[PDB]
């Protein structure tokens, strides 16, 4: 009640009355921060200097009645002096210590409930489990990770709506709660915040922390979930990894995503193996996701995915043969298709490389609010029958089907500001960007899709671009069914040695070719427990560790390469690297490198340690003879084709001669021991297939030549060739 008395007293004063009368509520936001105190430009020195003076702290004027001016030792706890620019009195830190010593105590059962975000950290750290610490060559990639997971069923708006309703129920305004999740959270918080005297601002700030999702760019190497990012400093180091399992329960979506990433990496690695089924079984039995063996997780988590299903079939479990796209579960009922990258130009002039699927295919889409039967061909929607519950649901299902079709009429429908690269310049998934853009605005897509006549059929009604149903016209190959469409069922399948899943009738359901090629990051850290502890790591880690293994075992690898190279090439340690070499060029590169090594062995001397270390991983795949000469070898890394130059140093693979150290993608891989047998003596002999690099040019045998043009030489003749980073050298064809 005293607030009205204070207002009357303020009104009584002339200046205060004028301020209160003239300043509007709108103007309050400006005068609220009207101060004279300028932000400190060197707070550390000012704090160190002020702690020496007698009264550096400022306390509310009320303290004068709550704390004696001096303690039992006579030290003055506070002063009658008023802080400049406020009513707060100036007090010494002795006052804070005295209050903490014998001040008025109150119940604190509300703090763990209001500070749940901070206390959950302690609660989950107390129940956390620590595994062995493994020293490795950690390769931390910078990407966006979750700092505060927030509430998965509430958006920013929903979170604020609950916040306001819970902390300031009267000041809520016109907003109204419109969700079961919002109502449940509001009820629980109100029940928990009964008789809470904590400052409402702190309650709102803590609720915002707990509810609003927050993300930040961090250099991560393990899981990107919040439960793992918070302990990122403790778990992932520059040269070590601490196996840690945070306490409490884990989000089902995080486990599903992590399992998908692990299964995709496992199938991609096992596909290049000699016995893919045996390799997959061993990897699946050795891999663990967030401290839980993948073997026991696959038996409880469906996570329908072209890789999860495969792994399950290998394990003998019944598969779903379904994949989730844009919130719709697609089941391929008939037909087959083959992926292939195609370059397209959108309606906003952007150029994309989308994975187009060739071949006629028929799918059943099941959604939370819709169900459709789709039939598509290569970049063309043949037919679509939607059975959505609501008009909004119908629009959502149609947009998803159109995006899934990949039709040119839809790509050209992209308009306005759409970016396929984030602020970090990373390449986003074009299908997801298109789906998001068209869900934000579908008017243009509907207008440009096209219209076709409707064949009168009972139960089928056409739909027009303005969303109103029609019986005579409809969108191209689109129908709406009012009677519903039928349903999920798991079918037992047989998997052969090459991971080709077939049904009871022998029809091939799943193959490793359809598994997504994107190298993603797991929400929950994935741990591998085999000798090749980096078998299922990402591209950069796989490359760095492969070359590190080659260098560490160099004293034996050199002997094996010089004596029995055919068996050395088949070493399992090169299989993960082969997972990154393009499938089409795998054989060409293997044959080329194998011939280069054989020619280096035939020519006495000319041994080049750096060249062997660099090209050894490319010889593992089976040879495929060709007349092609490669100036560089391409390896896939997070969708980018990194080029390893056959001759010379490149940022991807560099050998520093001063320190005699190898760096792969900027990560040190080791030092090369001084070999008396090296004796380069100028001649290289390991740059061109069937050609020896004599050395510096002399402008006598020829002005210049190209790498492919050099094929004209028959035998014995010498000529100048422009090979590498603009380095013309003299060469001889055998």
């Amino acid at each position: 009640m005293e607030r009205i008395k204070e207002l009357r007293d303020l009104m009584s004063q002339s200046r205060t009355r004028e301020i209160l009368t003239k300043t509007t509520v709108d103007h309050m936001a400006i005068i609220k921060k009207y101060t004279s105190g300028r932000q400190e430009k060197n707070p550390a020195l000012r704090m160190k200097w002020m702690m020496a003076m007698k009264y550096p702290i400022t306390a509310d004027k009320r303290i004068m009645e709550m704390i004696p001016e001096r303690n039992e030792q006579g030290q003055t706890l506070w002063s009658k002096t008023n802080d400049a620019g406020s009513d707060r009195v100036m007090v010494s830190p002795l006052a804070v210590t005295w209050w903490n010593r014998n001040g008025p105590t109150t119940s604190t059962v509300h703090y763990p409930k209001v500070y749940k975000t901070y206390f959950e950290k302690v609660e989950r750290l107390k129940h956390g489990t620590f595994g062995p610490v493994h020293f490795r060559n950690q390769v931390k990639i910078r990407r966006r990770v979750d700092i505060n997971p927030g509430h998965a069923d509430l958006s920013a708006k929903e979170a604020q709506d609950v916040i306001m309703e819970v902390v300031f129920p009267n000041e809520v305004g016109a907003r109204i709660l419109t969700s079961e999740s919002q109502l449940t959270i509001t009820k629980e918080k109100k029940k928990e915040l009964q008789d809470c005297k904590i400052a409402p601002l702190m309650v709102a700030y803590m609720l915002e922390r707990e509810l609003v999702r927050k993300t930040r760019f961090l250099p991560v190497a393990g899981g990107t979930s919040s439960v793992y990012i918070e302990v990122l400093h403790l778990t992932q180091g520059t040269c070590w990894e601490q196996m840690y399992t945070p306490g409490g329960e884990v989000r089902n979506d995080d486990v599903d995503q992590s399992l998908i990433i692990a299964a995709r990496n496992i199938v991609r690695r096992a596909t290049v193996s000699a016995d893919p089924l045996a390799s997959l079984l061993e990897m699946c039995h050795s891999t663990q996701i967030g401290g839980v063996r993948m073997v026991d997780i696959l038996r409880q988590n469906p996570t329908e995915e072209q890789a999860v299903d495969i792994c399950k079939a290998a394990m003998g479990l019944r598969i779903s043969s379904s994949f989730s796209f844009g919130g719709f579960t697609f089941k391929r009922t008939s037909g087959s298709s083959v992926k292939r990258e195609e370059e397209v130009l959108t309606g906003n002039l952007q150029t994309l490389k989308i994975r187009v699927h060739e071949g006629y295919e028929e799918f059943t889409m099941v959604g939370r609010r819709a169900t459709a039967i789709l039939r598509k061909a290569t970049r063309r929607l043949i037919q679509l029958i939607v059975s959505g519950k609501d008009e909004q649901s119908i629009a959502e299902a149609i947009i998803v089907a159109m995006v899934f079709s990949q039709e040119d009429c839809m790509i050209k429908a992209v308009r306005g500001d759409l970016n396929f690269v984030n602020r970090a310049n990373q390449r986003l998934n074009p299908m997801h960007q298109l789906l998001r853009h068209f869900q934000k605005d579908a008017k243009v897509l509907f207008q440009n899709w096209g219209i076709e006549p409707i064949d009168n059929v009972m139960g089928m009604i056409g739909i027009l671009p303005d969303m109103t149903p029609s019986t005579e016209m409809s969108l191209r190959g689109v129908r709406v069914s009012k009677m519903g469409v039928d349903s999920t069922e798991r079918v037992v399948v047989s998997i052969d040695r090459f991971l080709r899943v077939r049904d009871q009738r022998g029809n091939v359901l799943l193959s490793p070719e359809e598994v997504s090629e994107t190298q993603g990051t797991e929400k929950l850290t994935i741990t591998y427990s085999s000798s090749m502890m980096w078998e299922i790591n990402g591209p950069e880690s796989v490359l760095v560790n492969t070359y590190q293994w080659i260098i560490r075992n160099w004293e034996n690898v050199k002997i094996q390469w010089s004596q029995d190279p055919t068996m050395l090439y088949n070493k399992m340690e090169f299989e993960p690297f082969q997972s990154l070499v393009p499938k089409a060029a795998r054989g060409q590169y293997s044959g080329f490198v194998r011939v280069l090594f054989q020619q280096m062995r035939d020519v006495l001397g000319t041994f080049d340690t750096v060249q062997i270390i660099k090209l050894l991983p490319f010889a593992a795949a089976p040879p495929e003879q060709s007349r092609m000469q490669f100036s560089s070898l391409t390896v896939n890394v997070r969708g980018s084709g990194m080029r390893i130059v056959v001759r010379g140093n490149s940022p991807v693979f560099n050998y520093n001669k001063a320190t005699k150290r190898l760096t792969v993608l900027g990560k040190d891989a080791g030092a090369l021991m001084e070999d008396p047998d090296e004796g380069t003596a100028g001649v290289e002999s390991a740059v061109l297939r069937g050609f020896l690099i004599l050395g510096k040019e002399n402008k006598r045998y020829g002005p210049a030549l190209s790498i492919n043009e050099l094929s004209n030489l028959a035998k014995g003749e010498k000529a100048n060739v422009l090979i590498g980073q603009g380095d013309v050298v003299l060469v001889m064809k055998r």
């Binding site: 989730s324 579960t329 099941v366 959502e396 789906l435 869900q439 349903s487």
Partner: peptide, 14 residues
């Protein structure tokens, strides 16, 4: 015959 949709990452149209 209300049914789910498994994984989902989409918002509502306008």
């Amino acid at each position: 015959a209300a049914a789910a949709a498994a994984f989902a990452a989409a918002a509502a149209a306008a």
